[PDB]
Amino acid sequence: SMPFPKDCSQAMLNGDTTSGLYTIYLNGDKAQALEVFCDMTSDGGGWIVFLRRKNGRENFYQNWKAYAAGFGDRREEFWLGLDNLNKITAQGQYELRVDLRDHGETAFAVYDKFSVGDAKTRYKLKVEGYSGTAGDSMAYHNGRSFSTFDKNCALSYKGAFWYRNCHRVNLMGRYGDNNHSQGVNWFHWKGHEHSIQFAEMKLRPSNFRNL
Numbered sequence: 001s002m003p004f005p006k007d008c009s010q011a012m013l014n015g016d017t018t019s020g021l022y023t024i025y026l027n028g029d030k031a032q033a034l035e036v037f038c039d040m041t042s043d044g045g046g047w048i049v050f051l052r053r054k055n056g057r058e059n060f061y062q063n064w065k066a067y068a069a070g071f072g073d074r075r076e077e078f079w080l081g082l083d084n085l086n087k088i089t090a091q092g093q094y095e096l097r098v099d100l101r102d103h104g105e106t107a108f109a110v111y112d113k114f115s116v117g118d119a120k121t122r123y124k125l126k127v128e129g130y131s132g133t134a135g136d137s138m139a140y141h142n143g144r145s146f147s148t149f150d151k152n153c154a155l156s157y158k159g160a161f162w163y164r165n166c167h168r169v170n171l172m173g174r175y176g177d178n179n180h181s182q183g184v185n186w187f188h189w190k191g192h193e194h195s196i197q198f199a200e201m202k203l204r205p206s207n208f209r210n211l
């Protein structure tokens, strides 16, 4: 086992194959411990979950400081934090996976390159190299800074995202809100008048598929 796994791929290879909460260590530094939810079953496992929507219990209409720091119950609905995502995606070449489920239908998207810049970039999104069944709805968002109501699409749709003008992905939108562009949307799967019941965003090293 590795003593200070830097992501859920190094925790999984540590022989932990059950999804749930694991300690990772940013940059493999024992003083930078982070409790994360690892999805160890989807397409080979090793995924740090960084967003989960499933029941509308948690408030995602939160401010910059909340989106930078993270919030919620990592076993239920939560947001991992932009500072965490920047530090994890700085460690190597990561891939993004999005898992969606709505009334028993599933879809997914994978982006072979995924990074989040630091605060001086307003947590700039990089997403490239799409495959999947959900439709490439993140391409619209590529290169955009993050937006909250206090740093306006976040205000107009009462969510937070790497907004443009405004969104094809709104997975931090209002739960169960089927009003146009208000809900948990993935446009190229279910459009802007269908709020998706279940959504996860997760990351792992892009090379994990052949390591």
Ligand SMILES: Cc1nsc(N2CCCNCC2)n1
Pocket (backbone or CB within 6 Å): 043, 044, 045, 208, 209, 210, 211
């Ligand atoms: C289909 C799939 N996605 S990742 C994965 N493995 C992780 C790396 C260890 N060896 C292979 C198992 N399998």
